[PDB]
């Protein structure tokens, strides 16, 4: 079963999961450079991050 679901997931997910930060980049190649993170929610607490990509 490990094999079966393996074969299922691979030929259905292989291109996926190469995640960015956050969704706001999409193409895991368009990704590059820094990227804001606002603590909590208030748009007066910015913090830079050399984000993306994600494995």
């Amino acid at each position: 079963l490990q094999f079966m679901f393996a074969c299922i997931g691979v030929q259905l997910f292989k291109g996926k999961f190469f995640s960015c930060n956050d969704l706001s980049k999409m193409t895991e190649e368009e990704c590059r450079g820094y990227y804001y993170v606002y603590k909590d929610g208030d748009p007066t607490q910015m913090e830079l991050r050399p984000r993306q990509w994600i494995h």
Binding site: S24, E30, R32, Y34, Y36, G41, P43, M46
Partner: protein
């Protein structure tokens, strides 16, 4: 820059590949002189090369970026330098879709540079003016407090994004339509008016079912009117909502067919409601729908809020490219307040290129303003609010009060310094007649005394 940037862009080839030689490296030639600032090193990517600012979120690593970077500087540098042949251009500046081109190497820039250009007002002036604006927040007992927070921030900034000479309301609606108090809108002191409306937005609890059409019913209507002010032009409304459940073509045909109405619909956050009826709507009525998923709110707001309104300007507009001067405001770099004349630059077949401008120190604006034959005051009121009158100093006005809660604090100046002529200096009715006379600009040499008490340091004369 118009005549020339139009050409290179027409022949920029725009081939990808790149990688090799662009621009690149980083020039670094120290200097110091007039117009403050020690020119030295300036390349995030006088004379000596050119500075090229980028949005801190935008990354110097794209087909689009460098492709611009070539053709822009590739000719701009030369002729702008030719413009330096005639001192003293204080800050020649180019502004594109993204990156700045600052001539001569003023050094950009633990502070975070949240600064953009699409947002920064002089650029906003350079694309489609003016704008009759009527917001419809959807406060319907439907949005959570989450997307409510987001949308709250959204209006909260967008009005800042909104032009500072364009009328605006806020039509909250659900189970009933209603307005934040004013009922006229607005001219905007920017300072006070926008603040009122904004803080009013600050309290905007969701509560009630979606009337939908009824809000529209007032939306066109509150947009309709005729009685005074209004400032006739483009006539557009902006829905910020989770997702409409219906078409409302009935009301549309009932009040629109001239299609002077526009619709900008902004679905936000996640939710799951269909974009359909909405996506139907803006396209239905000339208008360009697009979303704000999280806090991508900054750049997305500007991205087509102006350009979609740039359509008429792209068309018959061409002889219209007369320079479009701005209201006074502080420079992003330390320098003091500086008026900036802008002009648009067109593509070739597409949706407009980019908006060049010149900084003009109000300092040297004062250099033309002699102060020696006299010893009291000049004052130079704008076509509407403000002058540059030596009746005041150099700080961003500000709303009212509020000491910030120190507890949460462990987003830095926004400008413009808008001012009433009326408030810059003492009221006299007759003098009010005078500013209301000059604001139309009709009268020429018309002049007379008004006997009047006058404020000084801290006690008045007459």
């Amino acid at each position: 820059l118009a005549l020339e940037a139009e050409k290179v862009q027409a022949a920029h080839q725009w081939r990808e590949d790149f990688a090799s030689n662009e621009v690149v490296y980083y020039n670094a030639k120290d200097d110091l002189d007039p117009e403050k600032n020690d020119s030295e090193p300036g390349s995030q990517r006088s004379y000596q090369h050119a500075a090229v600012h980028i949005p801190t979120d935008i990354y110097e690593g794209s087909t689009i970026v460098l492709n611009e970077l070539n053709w822009t500087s590739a000719l701009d540098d030369v002729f702008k330098k030719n413009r330096e042949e005639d001192p003293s251009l204080l800050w020649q500046v180019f502004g594109s879709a993204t990156g700045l081109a600052r001539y001569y190497p003023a050094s950009p820039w633990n502070k975070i540079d949240l600064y953009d250009v699409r947002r920064r007002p002089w650029y906003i002036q350079g694309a489609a003016s003016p704008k009759d604006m009527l917001i419809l927040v959807d406060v319907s007992g439907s949005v959570s407090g989450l997307t409510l927070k987001l949308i709250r921030t959204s209006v909260s900034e967008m009005l800042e994004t909104l032009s500072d000479d364009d009328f605006v309301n806020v039509a909250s609606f659900n189970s009933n339509a209603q307005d934040v108090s004013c009922f006229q809108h607005l001219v905007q002191a920017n300072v006070r008016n926008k603040k009122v409306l904004k803080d009013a937005v600050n309290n905007i609890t969701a509560k009630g079912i979606t009337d939908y059409k009824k809000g529209f019913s007032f939306a066109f209507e509150q947009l309709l009117n005729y009685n005074v002010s209004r400032a006739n032009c483009n006539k557009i409304i902006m829905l910020f909502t989770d997702g409409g459940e219906e078409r409302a073509q009935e009301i549309f045909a009932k009040y629109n067919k001239d299609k002077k109405v526009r619709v900008f619909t902004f679905s936000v956050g996640q939710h799951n409601y269909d974009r359909g009826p909405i996506q139907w709507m803006a396209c239905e009525n000339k208008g360009y729908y697009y979303e704000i998923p999280s806090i991508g709110a900054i750049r997305i707001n500007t991205q087509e809020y102006l350009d979609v309104l740039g359509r008429p300007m792209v068309l018959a507009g061409d002889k219209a490219k007369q320079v479009q001067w701005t209201n006074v405001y502080l420079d992003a770099l330390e320098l003091g307040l500086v008026i900036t004349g802008t002009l648009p630059v067109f593509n070739i077949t597409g949706q407009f290129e980019n908006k060049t401008n010149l900084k003009n120190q109000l300092i040297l604006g004062v250099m033309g303003v002699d102060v020696s034959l006299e010893d009291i005051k000049r004052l130079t009121p704008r076509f509407t609010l403000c002058p540059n009158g030596y009746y005041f100093a150099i700080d961003p006005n500000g709303y009212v009060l509020l000491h910030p809660n120190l507890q949460p604090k462990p987003p830095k100046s926004q400008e413009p310094v808008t001012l009433d002529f009326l408030d810059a200096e003492l009221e006299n009715d007759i003098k009010v007649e005078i500013r209301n006379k000059m604001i139309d600009g009709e009268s020429g040499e018309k002049t007379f005394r008004t006997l009047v008490k006058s404020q000084d340091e801290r006690y008045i004369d007459k």
